[PDB]
């Protein structure tokens with residue numbers, strides 16, 4: 048009961064976990080999430096680029 | 103003729119037995135049975151928590 | 158993947174994409190399309206290699222020790238209290254986040270060296286070692302042969318020199334919902350005593366030792382420990398360590414300049 | 429009828445007005461809220477004082493000067509002496525809460541200067557003397573602000589207060605990763621942050637751990653021409669938000 | 683599996699068990715509850731500590747003797763020093779609450795005696811000296827029980843503690859109109875009352891007004907034969923119920 052994922056390109060690769068503890072698995076590098084809104088624009092008030100930050 | 107079981111998490115893992123004697127297999131750790139009623143409440147008489155043990 | 162560029166022509170408006178109020182604390186979402194004309198560019202660049210997972214997921218030495226094949230009195234084995242602050246490299250990396258959560262991939266590189274003597278007729282057999290982990294509270298070894306090396310419960314690894322380096326995986330053994338990289342607090346409720354990360358620190362010791370003495374000739378083996386975070390989670394970014402490290406048990410430092418100087422505030426010839 | 433400067437915040441018997449502001453920085457985008465049954469460990473029922481505790485407490489003021497290097501206030505403690513907050517804080521083993529920090533400072537159109545207002549969570553600090561650990565009094569003085577220095581601090585058990593490193597061994601100019609706002613006299617008047625509970629555990633003791641430190645450092649030194657008012661104070665006002673408490677008992681701290 | 687003696691009461695971190703009781707007297711049939719928007723005057727939002735305050739506080743014990751005339755404890759105050767109750771009580775102008783009073787005393791099958799446990803609301807007392815008014819210390823001593831006398835009290839500013847009149851100028855044997863239970867060593871062990879908030883106003887100050895007094899007077903003198911245990915203590919345990927508070931400010935009492 049394996050699984051096929053795509054490779055890192057500019058084709059996939061098959062894979063099976065042989066161990067019972069998920070900690071044994073390899074690093075998940077096919078991951079790609081991202082939220083910069085935490086660090087930039089953490090203002091309660093949404094800002095329009097065209098507008099001024101004071102009006 | 104393999105078998106897939108879930109891993110220990112907070113995804114599965116495939117597995118096949120290669121030997122003829124079941125003693126050769128790995129420890130079954132995916133097990134989780136439990137009966138404390140043997141050791142606690144081993145009384146022939148069921149006890150209601152709200153009630154007293156003498157009446 | 159990165160965002161591609163948008164085609165931009167000339168503008169004439171009361172719109173001020175070029176001016177904001179940094180005092181806001183909000184970072185500008187200003188692209189080059191504003192404040193200048195641009196062609197259209199379909200950008201394929203991927204940020205794949207800057208993912209938190211990839212930034213950390215690489216084995217790094219965190220420490221190492223020594224022990225002799227011989228010595229009367231037992232006393233010829235070593236130990237080390239697990240911790241990731243005795244090495245500059247990795248510490249600084251992990252300390253770019255306040256809290257983190259991850260599994261660990263342990264890899265050991267064991268090597269042996271032979272020292273000068275007078276001993277003759279030496280035809281030394283293979284060397285077999287033993288690394289034993291001892292969770293906090295467990296009975297610790299005293300001599301190269303105290304009963305505790307039976308590891309009836311404590312896990313450990315036996316390894317014969319000449320083979321591929323030993324390796325295991327460790328789950329997220331934290332008590333809280335994550336590892337703490339910093340701790341602006343004390344150990345006791347009366348602020349007396351230990352202050353610093355040193356209080357959250359408590360993950361047991363690691364014991365190494367030769368199983369067989371090999372020969373009567375003096376030998377000294379060295380064990381190198383390598384960590385490698387996997388399945389990573391990181392919270393609250395921090396300013397990388399500016400000052401050099403001075404202690405393993407605290408943040409202590411001696412004041413350092415923000416950067417290096419140049420001649421004028423106009424010198425392009427950078428330092 | 430408005431200005432993105434105007435602003436009215438109310439919690440309990442307290443109310444804040446802003447005649448000059450930017451916006452309101454909100455933690456890491458996360459707005460504070462009560463601990464869910466899914467993230468809890470303490471099984472006892474928690475206390476939620478509400479109005480009695482989640483209100484605006486205004487600490488002692490401080491005077492800004494042409495040489496002032498900066499100030500800081502540890503937080504879990506600083507309110508250790510404020511009404512029923514400090515109380516629930518003494519009678520309980522565990523507690524968790526968010527905050528609404530409001531730093532206020534005002535000058536005239538003729539004054540100039542610029543302050544950085546940040547909330548450093550887990551701001552562990554180093555000792556002035558490599559071999560020791562900085563004593564408690566040097567770390568925090570409750571409502572009394574502590575001070576950074578425009579040079580190296582000295583011996584015994586003090587904190588390495590030299591401003592360039594914020595006493596944390598980093599580049600002071602990078603503190604901007606943590607929640608912050610700037611008070612630029614020229615265009616500002618006040619700064620307001622909304623720090624949510626941030627920690628590696630659902631709850632914590634409040635006298636043993638300071639989950640974050642407020643720092644007010646001036647990057648643009650205050651200045652003014654002769655004749656201008658010379659005393660320019662800074663005042664910090666903070667308000668606990670969604671404070672829960674667990675493990676009730678006698679009061680104190682070991 | 684039960685006995686109308688058995689009994690388990692729980693509020694907060696506290697729990698009461700009754701191996702010997704009658705029933706549970708409940709105020710005037712009225713069970714305590716939070717003030718409705720229809721009966722209120724204070725417009726500010728009230729604080730409802732809940733678990734932190736509505737729990738079981740156990741006052742100092744007292745020794746019963748063959749001569750003991752009786753004891754009493756004023757109430758709004760008596761808990762003025764008990765954890766967060768006493769606190770919310772110091773920081774607020776207004777407050778209202780119900781109570782669960784539990785008087786406990788135990789002897790052996792060979793001891794005999796009988797106590798009257800009552801809750802006198804608005805128990806105004808007279809002075810030992812006609813011309814004056816009894817000083818505060820004579821009226822209540824917080825958790826320390828005050829004592830009645832088997833004779834006339836004397837001069838200055840004390841209370842006319844002679845038991846026959848309960849210091850109120852009435853017939854001690856009529857106190858039974860107020861909520862009460864009897865502790866008859868022979869068949870009893872504890873007494874439990876549930877006093878609801880009773881007053882001519884939705885809320886009141888707590889240091890200026892004692893809305894009721896608990897009295898424990900023995901009508902059947904304690905006795906026992908030689909050899910029997912000689913020390914028979916009485917212990918009062920009370921628990922605030924549905925406590926609300928209004929008008930927050932600094933703390934104290936004028």
Ligand SMILES: CCCCCCCCCCCCC/C=C/[C@@H](O)C(CO)NC(=O)CCCCCCC
Pocket residue numbers: 239240241242251261263288289290312313314325327330331332335336337338339354357358359360
């Ligand atoms: C044969 C097999 C042997 C296996 C041996 C495994 C040994 C355990 C290695 C664990 C390494 C964890 C590294 C995580 C970093 C944390 O140390 C830090 C970092 O500043 N602080 C902290 O200390 C964080 C506080 C969290 C407390 C956790 C308590 C367990």
